Amino acid sequence: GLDAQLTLVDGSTDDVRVNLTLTNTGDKPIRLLKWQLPGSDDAPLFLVERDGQPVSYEGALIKRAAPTDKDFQLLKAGQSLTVQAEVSGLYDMSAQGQYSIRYQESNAITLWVEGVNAGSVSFSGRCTNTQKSDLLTALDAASGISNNASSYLAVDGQRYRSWFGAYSSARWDQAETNFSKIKDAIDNKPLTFDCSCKQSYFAYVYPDQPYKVYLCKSFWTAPVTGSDSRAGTIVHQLSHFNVVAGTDDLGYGQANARNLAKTDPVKALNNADNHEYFAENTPS
Amino acid sequence: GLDAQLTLVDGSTDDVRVNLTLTNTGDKPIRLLKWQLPGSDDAPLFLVERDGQPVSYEGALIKRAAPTDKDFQLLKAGQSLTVQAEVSGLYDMSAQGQYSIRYQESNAITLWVEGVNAGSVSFSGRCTNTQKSDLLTALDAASGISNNASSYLAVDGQRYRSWFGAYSSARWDQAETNFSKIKDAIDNKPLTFDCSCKQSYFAYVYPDQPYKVYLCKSFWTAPVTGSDSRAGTIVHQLSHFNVVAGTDDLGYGQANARNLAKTDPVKALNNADNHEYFAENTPS
Ligand SMILES: [Cl-]
Ligand SMILES: [Cl-]
Ligand SMILES: [Zn+2]
Ligand SMILES: [Zn+2]
């Protein structure tokens, strides 16, 4: 027969990693569908319950052809295979509470889940409970710098001059209106964060697909606040949506933004990093 | 200086491929931002106009760090580099008409665009005008098999028995209600097709993200109608959405579906390929 043993992996993050050991206890080799083993392809391979109630699978479903030889993993007589999966990225484990997880069938393992923490926030692209929690934390920080930016623009200034260049009331109203909409998106709109991107840069968006922001490797290496920070990256990204500010990416980096501000204030007003650096205001 | 020459590539499809030659006409080497050359990363590098009116860029915008040495392509004195891009996947070229394209700046090239052709259809993931047209064609065919499936379920049967097993009125009503919703999605809902997937299988969906269907390699190799066809793949995929039929992927392939129908009609009623094969009805 085929036995499935599941063990929780102990770790210091909020992720939920499990080790699954499949063992062929019989005397003849058996063939296992690779699709039915944890992997790079989403599959609903677990029963996950919070407090006795199943929670949702959040991954994709895939149409595949009938399997051929290529699609099987062979397990010899007596032989075991162990694979590790992170479960929080694939099921709805966002709410605090006592969870069980069973492969499905294995024994159930159980654990406590801390809880990741108008407007709403959704996730896709296998964000783990760590990433979800970090993203919400980064959003609260973005809210802080975006509120600050708005308050500044409403009062009456080197901060403005730095990022947006020579004063004109039309450009200053334009900047204030852009920050007003960014603050409204953070405060009141349905945001989506996606964690599937493995690229070396910070994030990307489609300006016609509000309000979904795709984080990449540099987001995770960035500090939560400060220059080129997780908070500022969310301000940058939001500013691109057609329904927010419609900014472009005309240049990257503080040095470039200060140049654009000096040489062509209209382009600076249309640049995402310029908006980011105005809100990050680091150094102050 | 740096000259940019753009040439249209002649081909027999509806795609819009262009060759861009950048030449360093100066006497010292120059460094070109790789981001500003066509590539795997979306960038808005072209001005595209239909009948004199710019059309929308549809790709992503990316937050990147300031460039370092790594981020440049070097072009020696006198030296040329040529790169090819497909423009239709990245701009809105869906409408019939006379277009110009200029890299931006290059000369403009011009051409005629045939036009790809309640409910609406959107695209993402760099679908070319060929793929868009093929997808719409496949949708009309899906509509045909889905209408047929609905008509069959409303009359009064080996077709039903094959895919859904022993008759009971509750299961037959359930099947009819699932096909009713699939036909309603095709007819009346905002569908999105995405072409970014390079996996060897047919397609995938997130059941909580209606009505976006991601096509992969086997979709493109499939015939438009018949067994495991582009039309049937759209019926399969649609059936998964929580707001359509909420089906699972419990088994793949006609042989498996006929088994499920024979052994556990309730699971057959919950299986996407079973719905697909009922509508494809091939052989009839
Ligand atoms: Cl699917
Ligand atoms: Cl971005
Ligand atoms: Zn499926
Ligand atoms: Zn950007």
Side-chain angles (χ1 to χ4, degrees), chain A residues 1-236 238-283, chain B residues 1-236 238-283:
Chain A
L2 173 76
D3 280 354
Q5 179 67 26
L6 189 67
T7 68
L8 179 56
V9 182
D10 298 303
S12 69
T13 78
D14 290 340
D15 295 352
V16 179
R17 286 188 290 143
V18 299
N19 280 333
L20 175 71
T21 309
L22 296 178
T23 301
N24 178 9
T25 66
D27 300 321
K28 302 298 188 275
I30 68 204
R31 268 185 330 153
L32 291 174
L33 275 176
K34 289 175 164 175
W35 314 331
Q36 290 174 344
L37 278 17
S40 52
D41 280 314
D42 290 11
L45 301 175
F46 295 96
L47 175 49
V48 177
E49 302 197 338
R50 177 183 176 275
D51 298 344
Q53 299 309 337
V55 306
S56 283
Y57 166 69
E58 301 199 320
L61 302 180
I62 301 172
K63 175 174 163 69
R64 309 167 170 279
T68 50
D69 289 346
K70 349 259 88 87
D71 303 313
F72 296 92
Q73 175 84 330
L74 186 104
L75 211 45
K76 297 164 180 202
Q79 168 180 64
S80 268
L81 150 78
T82 293
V83 287
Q84 189 167 288
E86 197 300 315
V87 182
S88 72
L90 266 184
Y91 285 85
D92 175 16
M93 306 177 67
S94 50
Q96 177 168 51
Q98 172 82 31
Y99 286 70
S100 62
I101 289 172
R102 185 184 294 262
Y103 167 81
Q104 184 180 277
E105 60 161 42
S106 73
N107 54 298
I109 63 83
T110 59
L111 55 351
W112 188 262
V113 169
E114 161 155 13
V116 300
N117 260 249
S120 58
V121 176
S122 302
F123 302 93
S124 57
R126 289 174 166 181
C127 305
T128 62
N129 275 359
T130 306
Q131 291 174 321
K132 289 179 185 186
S133 181
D134 282 359
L135 279 153
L136 293 170
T137 285
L139 187 56
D140 285 334
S143 172
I145 60 175
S146 128
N147 290 347
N148 184 101
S150 293
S151 294
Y152 176 102
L153 294 166
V155 311
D156 273 324
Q158 190 53 53
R159 191 170 164 186
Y160 175 92
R161 181 181 299 115
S162 283
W163 307 112
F164 296 118
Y167 176 77
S168 87
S169 62
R171 294 200 288 265
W172 177 293
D173 291 334
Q174 170 86 259
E176 189 169 11
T177 292
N178 290 342
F179 281 104
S180 173
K181 296 302 289 185
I182 293 172
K183 166 175 160 58
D184 171 82
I186 299 176
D187 288 349
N188 299 319
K189 286 304 187 284
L191 313 182
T192 303
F193 295 111
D194 180 276
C195 298
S196 54
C197 174
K198 306 298 202 255
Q199 295 309 294
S200 71
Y201 44 66
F202 287 76
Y204 66 82
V205 309
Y206 303 91
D208 59 9
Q209 305 179 16
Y211 300 81
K212 188 165 178 178
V213 174
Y214 299 78
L215 301 315
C216 304
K217 290 190 171 195
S218 298
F219 180 79
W220 297 114
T221 59
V224 177
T225 44
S227 288
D228 285 317
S229 60
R230 290 179 187 185
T233 288
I234 289 164
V235 172
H236 176 118
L238 281 166
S239 73
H240 284 315
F241 295 111
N242 292 333
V243 295
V244 176
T247 60
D248 301 311
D249 265 341
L250 308 172
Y252 299 108
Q254 286 205 181
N256 188 88
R258 292 187 162 267
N259 180 67
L260 218 49
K262 280 221 150 182
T263 68
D264 198 332
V266 169
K267 289 177 197 279
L269 186 51
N270 193 39
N271 191 47
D273 270 357
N274 286 249
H275 287 73
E276 171 171 2
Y277 302 137
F278 176 92
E280 294 175 346
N281 193 31
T282 303
Chain B
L2 173 76
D3 280 354
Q5 179 67 26
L6 189 67
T7 68
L8 179 56
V9 182
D10 298 303
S12 69
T13 78
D14 290 340
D15 295 352
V16 179
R17 286 188 290 143
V18 299
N19 280 333
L20 175 71
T21 309
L22 296 178
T23 301
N24 178 9
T25 66
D27 300 321
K28 302 298 188 275
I30 68 204
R31 268 185 330 153
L32 291 174
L33 275 176
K34 289 175 164 175
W35 314 331
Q36 290 174 344
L37 278 17
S40 52
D41 280 314
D42 290 11
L45 301 175
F46 295 96
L47 175 49
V48 177
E49 302 197 338
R50 177 183 176 275
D51 298 344
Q53 299 309 337
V55 306
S56 283
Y57 166 69
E58 301 199 320
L61 302 180
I62 301 172
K63 175 174 163 69
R64 309 167 170 279
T68 50
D69 289 346
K70 349 259 88 87
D71 303 313
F72 296 92
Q73 175 84 330
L74 186 104
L75 211 45
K76 297 164 180 202
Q79 168 180 64
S80 268
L81 150 78
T82 293
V83 287
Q84 189 167 288
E86 197 300 315
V87 182
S88 72
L90 266 184
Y91 285 85
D92 175 16
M93 306 177 67
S94 50
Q96 177 168 51
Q98 172 82 31
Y99 286 70
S100 62
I101 289 172
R102 185 184 294 262
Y103 167 81
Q104 184 180 277
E105 60 161 42
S106 73
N107 54 298
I109 63 83
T110 59
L111 55 351
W112 188 262
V113 169
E114 161 155 13
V116 300
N117 260 249
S120 58
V121 176
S122 302
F123 302 93
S124 57
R126 289 174 166 181
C127 305
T128 62
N129 275 359
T130 306
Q131 291 174 321
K132 289 179 185 186
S133 181
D134 282 359
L135 279 153
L136 293 170
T137 285
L139 187 56
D140 285 334
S143 172
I145 60 175
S146 128
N147 290 347
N148 184 101
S150 293
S151 294
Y152 176 102
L153 294 166
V155 311
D156 273 324
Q158 190 53 53
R159 191 170 164 186
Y160 175 92
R161 181 181 299 115
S162 283
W163 307 112
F164 296 118
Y167 176 77
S168 87
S169 62
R171 294 200 288 265
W172 177 293
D173 291 334
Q174 170 86 259
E176 189 169 11
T177 292
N178 290 342
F179 281 104
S180 173
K181 296 302 289 185
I182 293 172
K183 166 175 160 58
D184 171 82
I186 299 176
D187 288 349
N188 299 319
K189 286 304 187 284
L191 313 182
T192 303
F193 295 111
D194 180 276
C195 298
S196 54
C197 174
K198 306 298 202 255
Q199 295 309 294
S200 71
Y201 44 66
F202 287 76
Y204 66 82
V205 309
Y206 303 91
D208 59 9
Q209 305 179 16
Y211 300 81
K212 188 165 178 178
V213 174
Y214 299 78
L215 301 315
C216 304
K217 290 190 171 195
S218 298
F219 180 79
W220 297 114
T221 59
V224 177
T225 44
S227 288
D228 285 317
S229 60
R230 290 179 187 185
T233 288
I234 289 164
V235 172
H236 176 118
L238 281 166
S239 73
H240 284 315
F241 295 111
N242 292 333
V243 295
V244 176
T247 60
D248 301 311
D249 265 341
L250 308 172
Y252 299 108
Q254 286 205 181
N256 188 88
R258 292 187 162 267
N259 180 67
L260 218 49
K262 280 221 150 182
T263 68
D264 198 332
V266 169
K267 289 177 197 279
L269 186 51
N270 193 39
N271 191 47
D273 270 357
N274 286 249
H275 287 73
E276 171 171 2
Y277 302 137
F278 176 92
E280 294 175 346
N281 193 31
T282 303

